[PDB]
Design a protein around this ligand. Structure first.
Ligand code: CLA
Ligand code: CLA
Ligand code: CLA
Ligand code: CLA
Ligand code: CLA
Ligand code: CLA
Ligand code: CLA
Ligand code: CLA
Ligand code: BCR
Ligand code: BCR
Ligand code: PQN
Lengths: 742, 154, 143, 159, 80, 33, 95
């Protein structure tokens, strides 16, 4: 059934098409009559569904494009590991990681920018990075710079291999459509073979290399004194001196006597109190169990043999009573459309990035991550933003499916039709609950603000005036703190210490994630988060559902996914397109993730992070001013924005001065974006035609006719400059704030 | 001594800026050994700062009460190094850019599809023109006299 | 006086499980634009109110919401399925105004029998300025 | 049982269990909003009584003087004020939507297809009677909620 | 409602009406062009103002021309 | 009484003049001749 | 005919076609007692003239509002209680 259907030499390797730009499209492969052409050359560059009509060439194009992306990421990791090897203080950071700033970038002394090379620590002048690569490397048992250079060279090798792979799998031997459509084998392999064997091999590294090395690094051993990792593979006596279960080898394994493996495959949940990260002993067992699970999960789908679930046979089996035929047809609209799959995988990968952000602060998995408050904050914020962007792109590509790849005649689905039928009900109830949440989450902030301004602090919604305690979250918190016991024995402690009954993991002078107390401010801000998420889903789901038709435009699909409008008629029908809906959902994702990372930064700096002296008195970075000031907007303006932006603006003449520079610059780029979002094309075309008169007066009339940006392009430029500016403002503000007071 | 500004060669606050920056860079210098790369780079930046301040002193820059060089643009012969000589240095290059670009657009104007030469820049043509903007202040003047600078409406 | 209206009878409607983009109170007090078409086979088409409908073999009838809905549907019909269509306008009083061809021929073939209105016999720049028609009902373009 | 409204698929609604069911349709059909044949005055009385209690609820315990001794009295006073305003806006609604003597704009049909009598609530005099009933019932429900908070304070929660 | 006007610079290409989604336009015979036809706008009451007609008029500026004017329920494109 | 003019004119203006004005203007909107 | 097999365009019965239906508008008779109904009729017929009802509502409500705000003391609203506190001298003396 499944096979390796692949055809040779379909496309010629030649620069002939490089010389002819815009070759991929018909209207673009004839010349730039205008300047918009170049914007259409980049816009449609990766719109392979519009270049061709057959799915075979599209699948080959995106396959080799994924290979290019993997080449890029291998080259990026090459850069990171190399810069760690040569331009870093990692060899010194291992000695005193609680006081040396992790730095992996040095600037060139030319124009005074050598101030950026600051006193990170370790006898090294550079930039205090906030990526957490140093923490990984301590978790990977690197203990050198040679290993990092070798890793960089190997990553460069794999980058070149992936580049050759894309070239081979497009130009030399490109797979045909029967190969991609065999999703059964693809899932069987990516579950068991990528995620199963990948987690298994990382468990092997974690058992053989990370665990024995971190058993010494945490035990006051200098990295120069540690035995090399391969010495544990060659000499098992040195490995057994700390974990004697290796003296028996795999006889405990194959005889199912796993009870004599707990020296290195543990379940003692919680954070290693010597470094603040999770127990690597638990992470080895984790990735091992995940290997078992993905290995049994990747033998689920029939590929060639009589066993396995045909995914058609799973989907067609589910047919609801008043839900109609049910999931019949979905295997044909997911295997004959890349955009549907792209949307699904984007949505899940984005929510997974967010879950990563959430589980990487509350269960610090790397050593000296929780105490590197810059790394923790930056990683949470990063992955939150990536998740929001991926979800918003999932919306865009659901819409693109609905416009292009949706065919109720051939590739019919029942549930999608049922969703389209009562789409007005969906959007009406979402448009209601967004207003309800908006009111009962932000009008509460307004109420607190007014009551505090009228001198009525006894009337706010605070932890002192009117109790809005998260009773449900408090119950989950208290039962997860008292989870070690009847419900989860053999764990020795809670799976995390972000719950009230937990304890404080004092690492050096720092505090590293004691319990998080949930009060009225957490209720208010969590409902603000639900609000912003619900409005984003309103906008995006509305764009997806009404991508094809509305009461306003019933032929919206014929106009396309990415179109500005259908004229000033009907009172005006700007931004009816799903592209414009996702362009608005970008702003709302921005507001959502911005208030999310603000909640994170403030709740952490006030209720979690800080410094605990040897007497035991923990003093937080702000001073616990979240539950009292995060109930009103003036606190976010005063105690969070105004106050914590006293280290990014005062950082002029310091090592953190590029942060204030990009603070002002990202401010600027955001505001500059407002020139695009607010304005319209017609003014700029008329202005351009005036200055084109000024040029034609001097025989400087360019043949590529100067055209103002297309409307959808003005909206794209506006949203990208707006997001870049707000996000770089926040990035600079967070990084300078959290590196300065640290 | 114009505009109430003292020169920087005889300013107090300018030397104070010098001393303050040097003490700032020396405070960041007592954390490394005096022979390693960070201390060597810090000493190089220190000499850079000291020569910078002394060069701003010896050029006759005018340092105000805040102790920073205030450039004079009015046209004083002593302060043509502030604006007028670099202004001519600018305008010479800027007109070079404009003139080679204009002569390039006029060169491709007699093409079948000229726009493809604005995308795919004809590097031989431009390179033969790229030095033709060296003489722009005279070629442009003649094109203005001959009538070839400004186009006619028809 | 060459093409009479068709006066749509009680024809069957397409098979459709019901949606929310249908007829609101606009039909209950204003027109609602019935469309009629004639299918060769029982095939499936996208509805302009969202969702998929199964047209019946033979004549069909759909009362959707407004003119643009039925005309978008009919254009998709004529282009994708190659099928003659005609749609109407059903006021709540009872009258049924025939509208789409109004000559038996679609409004692309310049078939004689239709009087030209909205027709200014001049180039578009030769319209008078507003000051020349200030304080007059004619705005700029009706002389 | 999500088949469309009256089996009509091109009307924008559906007979789902929430809309058209023996329990919820019965409940929405035997309450004073949908009692069409009966005169609108008793309907408005019932409506106003219910909403007067419902408004006195979140004025005594939730308000500016909830903790004071003037909680119940002044809260009921604010509830009566909101009731007066609701009758006010109902009144301008009846004036603006239908003028003086037109027939009812309500549907004269039903799901079963019976040419029933139109709901005289939607007329001018009918809506006026409904507003009068709403005002009377609402002030009465406000004062009765005040009475029950006065004489029967102990079974209800104070907190 | 809207005031659609067709000027004499037409070429009778039948793209205005074939783009018009509300049957506002219709081609009529004429003697001013090689195609011997010109567009007319009888059903301006059905005109929503979407300007798909004049987004498909291939002339110097335009021949068909939509003027936004008194907006009714059908020019505003309301199903309610 | 001058201190009691706030107690008479502000509730008069900011509540009744909206009642009178918005009511009469809603009637002027919803009119026919 | 509206009741035919998938026919929803009875041109005579345009109410069934356009959706004119009292979806829950029961035409069932008065379920109230006659005596209390007559009581409410006689005691609410004053509120039968919408215009007189509106004039009465606006004027009496404004009168009651002014009466409440003028007769209420500072015990029920602090704005009438007054300062009952010495005034703070502003910055720079008082300016
Ligand atoms: C280097 C050798 C080489 C050569 C000569 C060609 C030649 C060709 N390829 Mg192939 N290709 C190659 C390598 C090569 N390819 C590799 C390594 C891959 C895997 C990624 C592919 C994948 C591939 C696909 C999937 C497709 C082609 C196509 C084409 C044709 C048109 C390409 C074009 O004009 O765009 C030229 C484009 C560029 C020069 C730039 C592309 C971007 C590169 C890959 C990465 C950019 C990295 C950069 C750092 C990121 C930006 C960030 C920056 C701002 C810092 C042409 C026959 C197309 C074709 O034939 O379809 C009709 C097509 O669909 N190629
Ligand atoms: C713009 C894209 C982008 C960029 C620049 C980064 C950048 C970073 N990430 Mg993030 N990340 C992203 C997207 C991105 N991430 C997304 C979309 C995901 C969701 C899968 C993650 C999940 C993720 C995790 C879980 C972690 C990072 C970490 C890091 C940092 C170290 C880089 C590294 O490779 O360490 C080495 C990488 C790892 C140790 C990650 C292990 C592999 C993960 C758990 C799963 C394997 C991927 C799988 C095959 C594909 C998905 C399967 C599908 C079923 C979902 C760096 C700040 C690490 C960090 O902060 O360390 C301090 C870290 O722990 N990221
Ligand atoms: C029972 C074997 C086992 C063990 C010891 C671990 C151990 C760990 N897991 Mg993993 N995990 C496992 C199985 C396991 N995992 C399976 C089968 C799943 C799939 C549901 C997961 C899904 C999972 C997620 C999604 C996350 C972890 C995380 C963690 C860490 C949190 C600290 C802790 O006490 O974990 C206690 C672990 C549990 C209570 C999970 C048990 C799940 C049961 C066996 C599934 C039935 C730790 C390294 C967290 C992490 O790495 O954050 C940095 C995290 O976010 N685990
Ligand atoms: C798995 C991830 C993924 C994949 C494979 C795709 C793939 C695609 N997307 Mg989707 N998309 C994604 C994520 C993804 N996108 C995300 C995360 C979002 C949310 C914003 C979107 C939102 C989105 C929209 C709204 C649209 C697409 C479209 C497209 C298609 C064409 C895009 C193109 O040619 O632009 C080629 C590349 C460019 C034009 C460059 C973009 C320039 C960016 C914005 C630069 C600035 C960002 C940078 C990080 C900041 C540094 C600035 C510095 C350089 C100074 C293509 C099928 C389009 C489509 O299908 O059209 C029909 C379309 O309309 N996508
Ligand atoms: C602070 C600026 C701001 C505010 C207040 C709003 C407010 C709103 N937006 Mg908008 N929006 C904004 C900026 C803003 N937006 C920007 C910059 C963009 C650009 C992308 C958008 C894009 C946008 C879209 C695309 C969508 C919204 C939606 C919403 C609504 C969700 C909240 C709601 O109704 O709950 C209640 C109202 C609020 C929370 C607003 C604050 C009001 C306070 C609490 C009380 C007001 C006083 C009270 C009534 C007393 C009146 C006194 C009397 C004298 C008048 C609401 C209309 C969504 C929507 O309409 O569906 C729900 C939606 O889909 N907005
Ligand atoms: C503060 C808000 C509020 C509250 C608590 C009530 C409460 C009530 N109303 Mg009133 N009503 C309100 C606002 C409110 N109304 C408004 C704004 C209008 C104008 C449209 C009306 C018009 C009105 C009429 C005409 C009637 C009532 C009636 C009723 C009573 C029962 C029917 C009911 O509400 O359930 C029915 C609920 C719905 C139809 C809403 C369904 C929507 C979803 C499924 C529920 C979601 C709830 C969830 C928690 C969120 C009950 C005392 C009846 C009455 O007074 O009987 C004595 C009656 O006949 N209401
Ligand atoms: C903010 C919300 C809120 C608050 C604070 C109150 C407060 C109160 N309610 Mg109300 N109530 C509310 C919402 C609210 N109600 C809603 C939404 C309903 C359903 C429509 C009711 C229905 C209700 C009834 C039926 C009764 C109360 C009564 C009461 C009082 C005693 C309850 C024991 C107290 C003053 C009781 C009372 O007599 O009040 C004095 C009473 O009998 N409430
Ligand atoms: C446009 C000019 C103007 C403005 C902006 C104000 C503004 C104000 N006046 Mg004044 N007032 C004015 C002219 C003005 N007054 C004149 C000309 C008179 C004499 C007829 C008064 C007599 C007056 C009294 C007696 C009172 C106010 C009060 C007020 C306040 C509440 C509004 C109110 O009830 O006013 C009512 C004003 C009128 C009906 C006169 C309109 C002409 C507000 C600060 C109240 C106050 O002191 O609040 C602090 C109050 O009790 N005003
Ligand atoms: C998310 C992401 C990331 C990261 C990632 C990572 C880090 C991952 C990892 C992953 C992994 C870690 C994977 C792994 C894989 C593996 C594999 C794929 C393997 C394979 C193997 C094999 C196949 C073998 C076989 C064999 C042997 C040899 C033994 C026995 C026999 C046999 C034959 C079976 C970043 C940040 C960059 C960016 C974003 C995205
Ligand atoms: C001395 C000085 C000053 C003043 C000055 C002035 C006041 C001047 C003026 C001037 C003027 C009043 C001028 C005018 C001009 C005009 C015109 C009209 C021109 C034209 C030109 C052209 C046309 C050219 C062109 C070109 C070139 C040659 C370059 C490049 C290319 C092109 C083609 C662009 C001050 C004290 C401040 C400072 C110091 C210096
Ligand atoms: C500013 C603006 C424009 C005009 C923006 C223009 C066209 C961008 C300016 C020209 C760019 C920068 C290209 C010029 C640079 C070229 C690559 C040429 C190189 C020349 C040297 C710099 C090398 C719009 O078209 C628009 C449309 C809809 C809503 C808002 C707006 C809007 O706000």
């Amino acid at each position: 059934e499944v096979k390796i259907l692949v055809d040779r030499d379909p496309i010629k390797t030649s620069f002939e098409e490089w010389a002819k730009p815009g070759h991929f499209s018909r209207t673009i492969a004839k010349g730039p009559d205008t300047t918009t052409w170049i914007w259409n050359l980049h816009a449609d560059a990766h719109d392979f569904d519009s270049h061709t009509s057959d799915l075979e060439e599209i699948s080959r194009k995106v396959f080799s494009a994924h290979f290019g992306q993997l080449s890029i990421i291998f080259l990026w990791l090459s850069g990171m590991y190399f810069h760690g090897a040569r331009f870093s203080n990692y060899e010194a950071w291992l000695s005193d990681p609680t006081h040396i700033g992790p730095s992996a970038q040095v600037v060139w002394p030319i124009v005074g920018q050598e101030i950026l090379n600051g006193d990170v620590g370790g006898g090294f002048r550079g930039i205090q990075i906030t990526s957490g690569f140093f923490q990984i490397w301590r978790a990977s048992g690197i203990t050198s710079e040679l290993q990092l250079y070798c890793t960089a060279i190997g990553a460069l090798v794999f980058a070149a291999l992936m580049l050759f792979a894309g070239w081979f799998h497009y130009h030399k031997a490109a797979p045909k459509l029967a190969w991609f459509q065999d999703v059964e084998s693809m899932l069987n392999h990516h579950l068991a073979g990528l995620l199963g064997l990948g987690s298994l091999s990382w468990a092997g590294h974690q058992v053989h290399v990370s665990l024995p090395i971190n058993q010494f690094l945490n035990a006051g051993v200098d990295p120069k004194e540690i035995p090399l990792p391969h010495e544990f593979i060659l000499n098992r006596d040195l490995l057994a001196q700390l974990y004697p279960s290796f003296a028996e080898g795999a006889t405990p394994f194959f005889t199912l006597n796993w009870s004599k493996y707990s020296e290195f495959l543990t379940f003692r949940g919680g954070l290693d109190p010597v470094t603040g990260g999770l127990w690597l002993t638990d992470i080895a067992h984790h990735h091992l169990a995940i290997a078992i699970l993905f290995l049994i999960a990747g033998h689920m789908y029939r590929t060639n043999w009589g066993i396995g679930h045909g995914i058609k046979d799973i989907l067609e089996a589910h047919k609801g009573p008043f839900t109609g035929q049910g999931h019949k047809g979905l295997y044909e609209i997911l295997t004959t459309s890349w955009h549907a799959q792209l949307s699904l995988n984007l949505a899940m990968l984005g929510s997974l990035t967010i879950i990563v952000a959430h589980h990487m602060y509350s269960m610090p998995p790397y050593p000296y991550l929780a105490t590197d408050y810059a790394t923790q904050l930056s990683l949470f914020t990063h992955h939150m933003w990536i998740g929001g962007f991926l979800i918003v792109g999932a919306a865009a590509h659901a819409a693109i499916f609905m416009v292009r790849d949706y065919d109720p005649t051939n590739r019919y689905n029942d549930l999608l039709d049922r969703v389209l039928r009562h789409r007005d009900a969906i959007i009406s109830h979402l448009n209601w609950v967004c207003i309800f949440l908006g009111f009962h989450s932000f009008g509460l902030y307004i109420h607190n603000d007014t009551m505090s301004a009228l001198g009525r602090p006894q009337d706010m919604f605070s932890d002192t005036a009117i109790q809005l305690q998260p009773v449900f979250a408090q119950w989950i918190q208290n039962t997860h703190a008292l989870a070690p016991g009847v419900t989860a024995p053999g764990e020795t402690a809670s799976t995390s210490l972000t719950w009230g009954g937990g304890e404080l993991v004092a690492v050096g002078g720092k505090v590293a994630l004691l319990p998080i107390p949930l009060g009225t401010a957490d209720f208010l801000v969590h409902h603000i988060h639900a609000f912003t998420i619900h409005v984003t889903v309103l906008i995006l789901l509305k764009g997806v559902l009404f991508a094809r038709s509305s009461r306003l435009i019933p032929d919206k699909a014929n106009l396309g996914f990415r179109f500005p409008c259908d004229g000033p008629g009907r009172g005006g029908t700007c931004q009816v397109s799903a592209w414009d809906h996702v362009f608005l959902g970008l702003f709302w994702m921005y507001n959502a993730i911005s208030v999310v990372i603000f909640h994170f930064s403030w709740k952490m700096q006030s209720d979690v992070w800080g410094s605990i002296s040897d007497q035991g008195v923990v003093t937080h970075i702000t001073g616990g001013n979240f539950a009292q000031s995060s109930i009103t907007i003036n606190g976010w303006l005063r105690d969070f924005l105004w106050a914590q932006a006293s280290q990014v603006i005062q950082s002029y003449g310091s090592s953190l001065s590029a942060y204030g520079l990009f603070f002002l610059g990202a401010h600027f780029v955001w505001a500059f974006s407002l020139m695009f979002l607010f304005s319209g094309r017609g003014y700029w075309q008329e202005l351009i035609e005036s200055i084109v008169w000024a040029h034609n007066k001097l025989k400087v009339a360019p043949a590529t006719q100067p055209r103002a940006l297309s409307i959808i392009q003005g909206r794209a430029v506006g949203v990208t400059h707006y997001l870049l500016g707000g996000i770089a403002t926040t990035w600079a503000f967070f990084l300078a704030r959290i590196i300065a007071v640290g | 001594d114009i505009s109430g500004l003292t020169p920087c060669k005889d300013s107090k606050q300018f030397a104070k800026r010098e001393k303050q920056q040097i003490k700032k860079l020396e405070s960041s210098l007592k954390l490394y050994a005096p022979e390693s790369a960070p201390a060597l780079a810090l000493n190089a930046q220190i000499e850079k700062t000291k020569r910078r301040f002394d060069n701003y002193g010896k050029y006759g820059l005018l340092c105000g009460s805040d102790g920073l060089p205030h450039l004079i643009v009015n046209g004083d012969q002593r302060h043509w190094g502030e604006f007028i000589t670099p202004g001519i240095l600018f305008l010479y290059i800027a007109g070079w850019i404009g003139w080679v670009g204009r002569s390039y657009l006029i060169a491709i104007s007699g093409e079948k599809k000229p726009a493809m030469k604005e995308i795919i820049i004809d590097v031989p043509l431009a390179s033969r023109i790229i030095f033709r903007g060296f003489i722009w202040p005279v070629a442009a003047y003649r094109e203005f006299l001959n009538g070839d600078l400004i186009a006619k409406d028809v | 006086g060459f093409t009479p209206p068709q006066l749509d009878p009680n024809t069957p409607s397409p098979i459709f499980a019901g949606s929310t983009g249908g007829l609101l109170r606009k039909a209950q007090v204003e027109e609602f634009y019935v469309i009629t078409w004639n299918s060769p086979k029982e095939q499936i088409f996208e509805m302009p109110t969202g969702g998929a409908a199964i047209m019946r073999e033979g004549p069909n009838l759909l009362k959707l919401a407004r003119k643009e809905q039925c005309l978008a549907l009919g254009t998709r019909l004529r282009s994708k399925y190659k099928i003659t269509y005609q749609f109407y306008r059903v006021f709540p009083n009872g009258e049924v105004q025939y509208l789409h061809p109004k000559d038996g021929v679609y409004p692309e073939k310049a078939n004689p029998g239709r009087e030209g209105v909205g027709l200014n016999m001049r180039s578009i720049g030769k319209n008078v300025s507003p000051i020349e028609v200030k304080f007059t009902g004619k705005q700029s373009y009706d002389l | 049982v999500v088949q469309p409204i009256n089996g009509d698929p091109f009307i924008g609604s559906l007979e789902t269990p929430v809309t058209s069911s023996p329990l919820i349709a019965w409940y929405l059909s035997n309450l004073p909003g949908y009692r069409t044949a009966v005169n609108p005055l008793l309907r408005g009385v019932e409506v106003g009584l219910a909403h007067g209690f419902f408004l006195v609820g979140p004025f005594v315990k939730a308000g500016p003087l909830r903790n004071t001794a003037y909680a119940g009295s002044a809260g009921s006073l604010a509830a009566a004020g909101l009731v007066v305003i609701l009758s006010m806006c109902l009144t301008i609604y009846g004036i603006s939507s239908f003028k003086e003597g037109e027939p009812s704009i309500a549907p004269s049909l039903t799901l079963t297809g019976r040419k029933k009598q139109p709901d005289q609530l939607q007329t001018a005099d009918g809506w006026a009677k409904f507003t009068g009933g709403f005002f009377f019932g609402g002030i009465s429900g406000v004062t009765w909620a005040y009475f029950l908070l006065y004489v029967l304070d102990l079974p209800y929660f104070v907190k | 409602s809207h005031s659609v006007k067709i000027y004499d610079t037409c070429i009778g290409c039948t793209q205005c009406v074939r783009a018009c989604p509300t049957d506002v336009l219709e081609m009529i015979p004429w003697d001013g062009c090689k195609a011997k036809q010109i567009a007319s706008a009888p059903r301006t009451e059905d005109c929503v103002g979407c300007k798909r007609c004049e987004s498909a008029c291939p002339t110097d500026f335009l021949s068909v021309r939509v003027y936004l004017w008194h907006e009714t329920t059908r020019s505003m494109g309301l199903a309610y | 009484t001058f201190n009691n003019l706030p107690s008479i004119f502000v509730p008069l203006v900011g509540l009744v003049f909206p009642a009178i004005a918005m009511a009469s203007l809603f009637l002027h909107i919803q009119k026919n001749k | 005919k509206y009741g035919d097999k998938s026919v929803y365009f009875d041109l005579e019965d345009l109410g069934n076609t356009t959706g004119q239906w009292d979806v829950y508008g029961s035409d069932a008779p008065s379920p109230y007692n006659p005596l209390q109904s007559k009581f409410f009729e006689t005691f609410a017929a004053p509120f039968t003239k919408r215009g007189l009802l509106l004039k009465f509502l606006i004027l009496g409500g404004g009168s009651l509002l002014t009466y409440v705000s003028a007769n209420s003391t500072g015990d029920v609203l602090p704005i009438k209680r007054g300062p009952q506190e010495p005034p703070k001298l502003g910055p720079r003396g008082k300016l």
